[PDB]
Design a protein around this nucleic acid. Sequence first.
DNA 1: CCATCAGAAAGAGAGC
DNA 2: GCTCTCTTTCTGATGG
DNA 3: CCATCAGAAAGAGAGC
DNA 4: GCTCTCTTTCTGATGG
Lengths: 396, 397, 395
Amino acid sequence: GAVLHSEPLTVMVLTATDPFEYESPEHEVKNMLHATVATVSQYFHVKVFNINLKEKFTKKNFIIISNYFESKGILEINETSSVLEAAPDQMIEVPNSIIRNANASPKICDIQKGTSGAVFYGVFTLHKKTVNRKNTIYEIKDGSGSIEVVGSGKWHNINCKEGDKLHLFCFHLKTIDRQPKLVCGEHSFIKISKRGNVPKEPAKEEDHHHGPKQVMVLKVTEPFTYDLKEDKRMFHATVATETEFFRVKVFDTALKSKFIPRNIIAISDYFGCNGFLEIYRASCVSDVNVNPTMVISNTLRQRANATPKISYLFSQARGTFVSGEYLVNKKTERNKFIYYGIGDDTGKMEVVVYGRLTNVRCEPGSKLRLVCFELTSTEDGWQLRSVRHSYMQVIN
Amino acid sequence: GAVLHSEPLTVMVLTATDPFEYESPEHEVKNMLHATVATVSQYFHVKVFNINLKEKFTKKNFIIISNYFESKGILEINETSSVLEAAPDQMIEVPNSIIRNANASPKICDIQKGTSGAVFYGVFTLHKKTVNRKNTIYEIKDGSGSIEVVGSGKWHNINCKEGDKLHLFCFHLKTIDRQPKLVCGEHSFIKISKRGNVPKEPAKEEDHHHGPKQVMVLKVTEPFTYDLKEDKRMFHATVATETEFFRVKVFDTALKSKFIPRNIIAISDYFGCNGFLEIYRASCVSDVNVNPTMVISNTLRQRANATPKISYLFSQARGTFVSGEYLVNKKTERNKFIYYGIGDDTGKMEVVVYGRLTNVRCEPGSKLRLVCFELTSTEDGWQLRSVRHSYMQVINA
Amino acid sequence: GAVLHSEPLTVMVLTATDPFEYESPEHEVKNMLHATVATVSQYFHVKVFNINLKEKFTKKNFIIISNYFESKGILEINETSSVLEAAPDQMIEVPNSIIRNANASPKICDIQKGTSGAVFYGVFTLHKKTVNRKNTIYEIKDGSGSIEVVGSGKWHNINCKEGDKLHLFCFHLKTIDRQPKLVCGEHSFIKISKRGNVPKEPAKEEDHHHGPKQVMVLKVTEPFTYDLKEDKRMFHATVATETEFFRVKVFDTALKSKFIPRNIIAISDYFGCNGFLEIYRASCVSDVNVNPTMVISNTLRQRANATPKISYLFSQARGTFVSGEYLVNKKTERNKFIYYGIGDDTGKMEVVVYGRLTNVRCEPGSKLRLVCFELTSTEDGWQLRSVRHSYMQVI
DNA sequence: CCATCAGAAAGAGAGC
DNA sequence: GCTCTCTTTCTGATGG
DNA sequence: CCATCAGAAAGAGAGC
DNA sequence: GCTCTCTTTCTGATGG
């Protein structure tokens, strides 16, 4: 079983986790937490079954232990162990070598080499998840190889997606299906850590792709005419779910009262054309302006209403559409065309405009907003020409 | 059984390694260290199973041994042996010939003529390395031949590379597959004498290569365009083997996903152009588990990602292409041309940029990151010129 | 059997033996030589069976070989192979490490581990020789061990002695009496490289040596008076054992009859002092040469009479006693000191003579033979000064 | 840093 | 007796 | 609705 | 070349 170290050994707390409901070997629903220590030469893992010791398990703190257990190399300190706060003259010196080694996550190829029954600790990016009835196969993967993780009990069907840093605590290796599988035990724990960030502009495809996508109205443009023959009215809008954002082309302006910012909507028939979500009828927008939902975690906000960088545009496919705000400094007018020379702190370029938008009155010395301009380039310099669904307006 | 020498014999300690752990005859995990001693007439290789004698096995120290074993012409000392420091009046003087002839490694061809089970000792050159799943085979070669060595267990893929100088301690000859091999033993030990770096630029080319190669990306950049007429995509990257490093060009932007730093990759049917290696189809990379246990050298990383000095650039043959980072201090724009005089802690030069990359706004005080630039010069200094595959970006504080 | 290497390979010749007789596989005696050649990455041993290639197989020559054979990893050249003369722009740069490994001998401890029939080359010191009726056992030794070498036929009872160097080419391995031995084969060769008789001045010591040392008298001086007051007489002699030479000061001149060149004598109860050997009484020496065969090698004879070069003397410790023959250039005399300028190709110094030896007539152009002079120096140069035991003469 | 390797320089044996 | 040369040796050199 | 701060990880230095 | 540690950077996180 688990041997017993009875010598008063001095240690220092490196890391720890929060109390969480576990199932003790007595079929109760108690609470426990994890932690790691480090002596003058080595480091240990620690299980804590007594939840009243959470104070002395703060990091950068020294404590002396006696009458503690040791199972499979892991120290076990329960409700019958001695954990006392050390004195200023009872501190051990841990070099900055055991510290950077304790928190090192192993390689998966080396998990495929061990014997059955051992314990592991580490964080891994998730490759693919496959939910089953009572467990789930979490395929974690790093540069060293792939392996399977089986999760049942309290960790069956947990809130995570394909790409989360799954920090794992106390898992047993098992030879299942002739391949290395990793199953949990009884003292296990999983803290989830998603690195959620995505700039650029999400472009959902699939034509006739109907359904729901109850997003949130963010920034919108006033309506305008884009076909002077038939006086067709439209306006662009940028909206976002909690995961992504979408640039919307609205062709029925009666939803101007429903495309007000800071509003939440669930919108139906959408056709993924040129990366835009093109609505063709107001009947796809329920007001629903009394039922909350999202919050959009700040960083998504600025991401959606980001103003791109000319350096970033030099690296996009010649045919993609833009939306940003930039400073003008030049202006030449040639036969019905108006070239607006612009640039920022990264690069400069030309912006050509032809058609109705010549009626825009602007001169160097004030900023300018752009929406839905194609990306082109010549031998001389790059360009962002005015297309059919274009729009622009000068600011303060 | 072995033989037992129960009489005092004086020796002079020559070489002595550091303590290392082994699996003793009782399959316990004990400590031992190797040592080479020499009498006035004959030298002797010696084993030390009692690590407490660590101080009395120092070079230039004379000792006397009593009640010590010996096997295959090699002395042994465990816990049941008496080793005593010899006083300065008990000095024996071992000539310089035993010193030059103890560290002399036996020629390989003569190792190809020893009996099955014989034990050897010598430093040799790593000509090619190969790691199995169980053991690890090392093909060594010198002026007399080649021979493979089986390193299983404690010697299953160590920390070394081709071109080093590995010191083999106590490896046994065994006819495997018709040819001799050096299999591991109970008292095996290997200490290294590293060498080889290959800094400077990458390597040469093999036009329309038919072979394969496994490296690891070290510095990838963003994609871009090098042709304005027909929209042609490409991006630069840095890759490396265990020993060599290479700066690569990729023209099918699709292979931007497979080209990530720290990614072990694989490349086949590749072209070579002016120090850079050209790929043309996505059917050349398969980042699907080629070798997980590959260890890249930190100095190699710092050499491939290295940025040369202006003085060093002066000593290069013009025609080689430049990559790295420098700082700007002058800015002079003329007709559709912009000049950026860069400088470092050795001097200053010029950078001539033309065309599309003139649409970038760099200013003195911010660092400029150049990749793939020609190296030209005139009577009035040196330049880095922007060519068909030039790339750069601005980074500041 | 052997395998055949068809492709041209360019090599630099490292070594070659003189030609020697051997028996061919068809039972005919012919000449062959052994060579060692190298490429830029590897060395090879080569057996050369076509003696017309003698001039091509010369050291530091570059040659191009094709249609050659391999047996046990060693190359073989017969009448069917081609060996041409490389052009100057076809030379190769052979690393010195390769020459080092090719000229290196295997250790005996590793030879003893060899499989039966393995072929070896190397140079080893002979420790013991036993000559039987039909073969000879040469027990050789190096720092790693000893092994017996069995020679027969041509290599039976060759003219060598313990201490000589034997260069062995292409000997095979055979187990005899459970002990590994080396044995001669079809292509074996031996070359002898002197022995181990190299002097380096006598030894010191000082205790009353009660032992004897049957030495041969090499050189002697006429008796002379080294103390004028009491008329004390002595002479100097150089003598040699077989491996060593010693300088003897004889203070009992009755031994003059016993010290004659070529006579062999036994010296007992002698005293080392200041690097010389001393004989205080006539009973220490007997005229009987009870070892008529004593042999003093020419290397030891010539080396024992050698006069040290002056520049070499500049490096010697002050206070040592020196004997040598030097050419006299300048002669000046001041208040009973005589200053004789002497010199050789290495340099120039002064011989300072005081007292009785000032009666020796010497003028510029004469050559001075000095025995037992003290080496000293001043700020202006180096001198050889006459002392109590000094002797000198003009030749 | 840890000891190796290499060009230069000194020492031994054969020959004119 | 002198000279050419193979052998042996010390210290500067390499390297990342 | 926005800026500052902080822990981790890649890159570099002193010394072995 | 190898190792401990000082330095620099990208990105996720805080709050009145």
